[PDB]
Amino acid sequence: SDTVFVRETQIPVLIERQDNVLFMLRLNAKESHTLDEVVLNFGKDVNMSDIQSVKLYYSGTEARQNYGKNFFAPVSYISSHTPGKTLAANPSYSINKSQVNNPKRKVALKANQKLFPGINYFWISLQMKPDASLLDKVAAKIAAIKVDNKEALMHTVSPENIVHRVGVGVRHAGDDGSASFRIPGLVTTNKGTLLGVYDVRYNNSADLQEHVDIGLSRSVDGGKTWEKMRLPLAFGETGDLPAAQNGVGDPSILVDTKTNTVWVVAAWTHGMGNQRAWWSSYPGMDMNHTAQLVLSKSTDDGKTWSKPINITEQVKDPSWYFLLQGPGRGITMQDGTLVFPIQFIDSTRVPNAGIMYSKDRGETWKIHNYARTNTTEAQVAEVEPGVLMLNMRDNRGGSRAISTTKDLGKTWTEHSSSRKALQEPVCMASLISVKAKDNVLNKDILLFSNPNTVKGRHHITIKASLDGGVTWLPEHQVMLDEGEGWGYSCLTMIDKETIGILYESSVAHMTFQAVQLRDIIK
Numbered sequence: 001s002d003t004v005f006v007r008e009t010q011i012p013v014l015i016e017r018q019d020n021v022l023f024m025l026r027l028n029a030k031e032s033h034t035l036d037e038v039v040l041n042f043g044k045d046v047n048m049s050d051i052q053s054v055k056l057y058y059s060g061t062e063a064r065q066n067y068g069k070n071f072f073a074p075v076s077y078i079s080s081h082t083p084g085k086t087l088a089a090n091p092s093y094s095i096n097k098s099q100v101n102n103p104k105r106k107v108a109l110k111a112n113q114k115l116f117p118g119i120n121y122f123w124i125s126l127q128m129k130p131d132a133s134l135l136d137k138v139a140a141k142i143a144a145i146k147v148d149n150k151e152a153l154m155h156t157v158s159p160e161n162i163v164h165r166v167g168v169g170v171r172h173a174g175d176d177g178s179a180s181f182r183i184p185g186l187v188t189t190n191k192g193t194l195l196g197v198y199d200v201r202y203n204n205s206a207d208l209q210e211h212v213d214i215g216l217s218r219s220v221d222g223g224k225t226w227e228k229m230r231l232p233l234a235f236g237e238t239g240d241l242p243a244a245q246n247g248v249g250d251p252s253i254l255v256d257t258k259t260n261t262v263w264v265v266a267a268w269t270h271g272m273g274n275q276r277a278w279w280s281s282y283p284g285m286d287m288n289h290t291a292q293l294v295l296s297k298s299t300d301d302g303k304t305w306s307k308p309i310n311i312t313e314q315v316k317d318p319s320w321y322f323l324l325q326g327p328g329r330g331i332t333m334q335d336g337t338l339v340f341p342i343q344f345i346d347s348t349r350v351p352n353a354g355i356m357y358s359k360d361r362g363e364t365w366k367i368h369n370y371a372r373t374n375t376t377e378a379q380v381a382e383v384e385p386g387v388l389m390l391n392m393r394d395n396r397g398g399s400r401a402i403s404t405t406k407d408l409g410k411t412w413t414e415h416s417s418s419r420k421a422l423q424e425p426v427c428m429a430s431l432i433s434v435k436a437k438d439n440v441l442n443k444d445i446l447l448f449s450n451p452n453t454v455k456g457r458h459h460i461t462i463k464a465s466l467d468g469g470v471t472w473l474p475e476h477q478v479m480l481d482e483g484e485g486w487g488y489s490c491l492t493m494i495d496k497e498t499i500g501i502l503y504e505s506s507v508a509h510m511t512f513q514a515v516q517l518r519d520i521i522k
């Protein structure tokens with residue numbers, strides 16, 4: 001007989017999307033003629049009232065040289081890059097064979113599809129209602145598949161007990177006339193307001209130098225809805241150079257918890273033609289030679305933003321090629337000191353990560369010594385009072401480098417977890433510390449997020465540690481995005497019980513997801 005192979009997806013279901021890939025079906029029809037229907041059963045706890053529709057699409061066949069490669073689709077069904085074409089399945093790739101609006105817990109999708117004498121691809125689409133809850137979870141099973149009016153044998157290659165989580169596409173390719181959005185940062189203000197910052201890359205997805213601003217999405221309802229985009233940092237035709245030679249990017253955001261003043265730091269590149277700032281910034285101090293470290297602050301819960309504050313003169317050694325913040329977020333230590341992770345290419349052209357701190361509420365800043373050589377992007381958290389843990393992208397590859405300091409970066413101690421506990425593909429990673437009194441578990445925890453792999457940027461994962469970063473137990477992890485993406489992410493606590501994550505996913509340039517703390521630590 002012919003067997004219908006089923007692969008359930010593990011990717012965010014965007015609430016605003018008209019389509020979301022839920023299942024993929026492959027059928028090599030050696031003895032099959034017609035695929036009549038597919039029967040689907042949603043889980044007992046699923047709220048069907050939040051589901052707008054369920055659809056069955058046919059996507060044709062496969063190239064004969066690709067038979068036996070165990071592919072479940074011939075092409076990407078829903079684009080995350082085509083401006084204005086990221087909300088619905090591409091009609092040229094997928095034929096809508098059936099649709100059920102306002103479905104019941106048991107859904108029958110009739111297809112009546114004449115099968116190609118060979119490989120046939122189908123997939124199931126799930127469309128949520130615009131008002132769907134961020135925390136409700138969707139589970140479903142394929143109960144039966146009818147082929148030639150008889151029950152077809154099924155073999156499911158994906159695992160059981162998959163939990164599909166929804167998310168909000170805070171930024172899609174093309175929004176507000178910008179080709180792409182990258183490099184997320186995410187914080188929660190003292191008033192519970194969510195602030196997410198990112199590169200707005202108008203012309204394309206290339207790094208600096210280019211036409212880039214720092215955009216900000218503000219949410220006052222826990223990430224359900226986001227306010228119109230703001231631009232805390234934009235330099236336009238500064239110095240009478242074109243905007244594409246005045247980009248600002250790689251933002252990092254922090255909240256001064258003592259005052260609720262919000263700070264955003266970024267790297268403004270001036271000149272440099274159309275080349276990458278990583279090898280186009282040079283020693284010196286002024287805009288005409290080296291990238292400038294600029295700040296903007298908000299004293300009204302992120303609604304309005306000040307003019308840029310250039311602190312390059314305070315902290316940059318003139319012999320460095322490039323000084324910039326570590327993208328993502330900063331912190332406020334228990335004693336009130338503000339800390340931003342930073343990275344600089346030194347006089348030998350080697351990058352090193354470290355921290356930059358202010359004891360006077362952000363008026364003056366300081367850098368002492370690097371934590372480790374040949375490291376770049378890093379995130380910092382106060383694991384225990386007075387002890388700063390820096391988690392660093394390591395160009396040696398394969399795993400994160402972790403170090404700690406007790407004197408604000410004058411001296412560093414290599415952590416036991418360094419270069420062993422947390423694998424990476426040399427990407428950016430998020431690290432936050434949540435203190436016992438500020439979370440529902442009444443335990444000090446560390447939350448870490450990154451592509452859980454050594455090659456490629458996929459399987460974006462949040463990991464939790466209860467012993468200050470010594471151990472990251474497998475049962476304390478949630479895999480949110482199996483698809484391929486740009487890999488950058490940033491974490492925050494929405495509330496004492498829920499984590500928020502803003503990251504570059506396979507379904508949207510800026511994707512927001514909410515994960516219950518008890519979901520990770522059960």
Ligand SMILES: O=C(CO)N[C@H]1[C@H]([C@@H](O)[C@H](O)CO)OC(C(=O)O)=C[C@@H]1O
Binds near residue numbers: 267
């Ligand atoms: O060029 C700059 C400096 O502004 N930043 C890049 C960064 C590199 O700096 C990398 O960390 C060193 O190779 O890479 C990525 C990325 O998504 O992989 C994004 C940043 O935009």
